[PDB]
Design a protein around this ligand. Structure first.
Ligand SMILES: *[C@@H]1O[C@H](CO)[C@@H](O[C@@H]2O[C@H](CO)[C@@H](O)[C@H](O)[C@H]2NC(C)=O)[C@H](O)[C@H]1NC(C)=O
Ligand code: NAG
Lengths: 50, 50
């Protein structure tokens, strides 16, 4: 299928209407970031030749 | 099949037709002794960086 980018949402704009929230939600979300790699070393002579 | 390593007793049970053993990286880590049919575990000699 041809993918859909998202649901249509026509915001009810006018020149004298405002939307004010009457409530709120406390949202907690995760963000995962890699920090470090595995530290490796090579004995180059031993790898190439043994 | 020659190499350098530390030969130690092993709990691995080879099938009777197998002689050598390899790990996921295809390096010989276990060998069956041809004289006495006992499986010997090969550990590389403990190298390191100074
Ligand atoms: C704001 O939203 C919260 C929920 O996020 C509302 O709290 C709920 O209220 C209903 C009915 O009053 C209860 O049945 C729920 O158990 C409540 N949930 C929680 C988590 O407390 C709250 O009433 C809303 N306030 C306004 C003014 O709309
Ligand atoms: C080879 O000689 C050893 C020496 O004791 C013996 O134990 C073994 O049974 C012989 N035969 C084979 C097939 O290894």
């Amino acid at each position: 299928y041809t993918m859909s980018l998202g649901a249509e949402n026509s915001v009810a704009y006018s020149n004298n209407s405002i939307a004010i929230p009457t409530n709120f939600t406390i949202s907690v979300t995760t963000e995962i970031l890699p920090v470090s790699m595995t530290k490796t070393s090579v004995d180059c002579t031993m790898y190439i030749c043994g | 099949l020659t190499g350098t390593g530390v030969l130690t007793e092993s709990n691995k049970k080879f099938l009777p037709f197998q002689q050598f053993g390899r790990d996921i990286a295809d390096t010989t880590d276990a060998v069956r002794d041809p004289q006495t049919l006992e499986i010997l575990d090969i550990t590389p000699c403990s190298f390191g960086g100074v």
